[PDB]
Design a binder for this molecule. Structure first.
Ligand SMILES: CN1C(=N)N[C@](CCC2CCCCC2)(C[C@H]2CCC[C@@H](Nc3ccc4ccccc4n3)C2)C1=O
Length: 387
């Protein structure tokens, strides 16, 4: 129902990440931790780094336990390396519990920390199957559920401001909510619609249809989930498989063809600027992603606006944006810019993910983001990719 203690416990933005305050060790060491549904390790800065003004100091914690095991985590953009151990962990604006959890003390990294992000570690909220070095390293959420009476569910409301936030504003602003163990009804409007979690590794889902202003992209639905489709708060953009990206960008260009944008804009590399307040939202299409429903042959859709997929960036008094839709070779990624339109319920207990219109989504007087259903959709299991 209502979880006032956890409402408004996030800060940050799509491009630098959304983080929650946590404490580690005895006496407690306060750290800001990025909320990542696209990984499964609780990994924190444990050595000086130019982008960190604080880090976890294992030698100062009386409850620290050394697992005498290293961990090496390469990813696309970079890597993080560290030392495994356990310690007592709490979330000050969370449930009133303290858990004994695994912690990867980061001793080396490349393109991991973000300059000016105000976070010092990440909270891998996905399943043990993708935890590093392997699935025996119990993720934080699994420890939390196992050691307390917290229900096996969390929900995220990521609030994009709709305009740039400077260094001081982003520190003073409310970035959203992470509700641990429940659903807070003040964070959304309309109904919650649930899609099944296909498999418990990433929060994997199945997209069954895509529309650009009601026009069906008309691709074989397997293409939408090649090689997977995931909900990931640790990725900025809506990332699409190569072929889907090329078809979607062609359709988005055609719908907005009253204005021509350079190639670098469509490549998500270059900003586009309009005189203050004149952004022509109306020329850009809405994008609808239909997701497999909980009922056989039934789907629902989530609709996003250009206010979600045009990411506000400071240039001048102009209103500037980056195109926050990009190509992927590792399947669809519903990143923070998509999550900003919705209140997202990671219902681990019922192996499903819920979507509802966010009470904090950015819109205009003419259009709103939407979560609607049901729609008759056949052979949805065929939309899932295999091998
Ligand atoms: C997609 N994504 C994600 N959701 N989590 C990770 C790890 C994925 C797991 C998946 C299971 C297997 C192991 C790896 C880590 C990022 C967390 C968010 C901050 C980002 N930091 C970055 C990213 C890019 C950067 C580029 C330039 C400079 C800094 C940067 N900092 C790094 C990732 O790559």
């Amino acid at each position: 129902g209502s979880f006032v203690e956890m409402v408004d416990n996030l800060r940050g933005k799509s491009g630098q990440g959304y983080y929650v305050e946590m404490t580690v060790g005895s006496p407690p060491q306060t750290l800001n931790i990025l909320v990542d549904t696209g990984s499964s390790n609780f990994a924190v800065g444990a050595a000086p780094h130019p982008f960190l003004h604080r880090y976890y100091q294992r030698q100062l914690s009386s409850t620290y336990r050394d697992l005498r095991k290293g961990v090496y985590v390469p990813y696309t953009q970079g890597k993080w390396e560290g030392e495994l151990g356990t310690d007592l962990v709490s979330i000050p604006h969370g449930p009133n519990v303290t858990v004994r959890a695994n912690i990867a003390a980061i001793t080396e990294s490349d393109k991991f920390f973000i300059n000016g992000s105000n976070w010092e570690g990440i909270l891998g909220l996905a399943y043990a199957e993708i935890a590093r070095p392997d699935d025996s390293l119990e993720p934080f959420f699994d420890s939390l559920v196992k050691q307390t009476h917290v229900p096996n569910l969390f929900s995220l409301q990521l609030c994009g401001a709709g305009f740039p936030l400077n260094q001081s504003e982003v520190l003073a602003s409310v970035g959203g909510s992470m509700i641990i163990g429940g659903i807070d009804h003040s964070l959304y409007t309309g109904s919650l619609w649930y899609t099944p979690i296909r498999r418990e590794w990433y929060y994997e889902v199945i997209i069954v249809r895509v529309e650009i202003n009601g026009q069906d992209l008309k691709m074989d639905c397997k293409e939408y989930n090649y090689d997977k489709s995931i909900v990931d708060s640790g990725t900025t953009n809506l990332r699409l498989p190569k072929k889907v990206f090329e078809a979607a960008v062609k359709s988005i260009k055609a719908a907005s063809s009253t204005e021509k944008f350079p190639d670098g804009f469509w490549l998500g590399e270059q900003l586009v600027c309009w005189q203050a307040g004149t952004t022509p939202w109306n020329i850009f299409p809405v994008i609808s992603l239909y997701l497999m429903g909980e009922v056989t042959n039934q789907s629902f859709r989530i609709t996003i606006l250009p206010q979600q997929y045009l990411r506000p960036v400071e240039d001048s008094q102009d209103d500037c944006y980056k195109f926050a839709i990009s190509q992927s070779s590792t399947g669809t990624v519903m990143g923070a810019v998509i999550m900003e339109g919705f209140y997202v319920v990671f219902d681990r207990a019922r192996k499903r993910i819920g979507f509802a219109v966010s009470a904090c989504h950015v819109h205009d007087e003419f259009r709103t983001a939407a979560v609607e259903g049901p729609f008759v959709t056949l052979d949805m299991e065929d939309c899932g990719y295999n091998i």
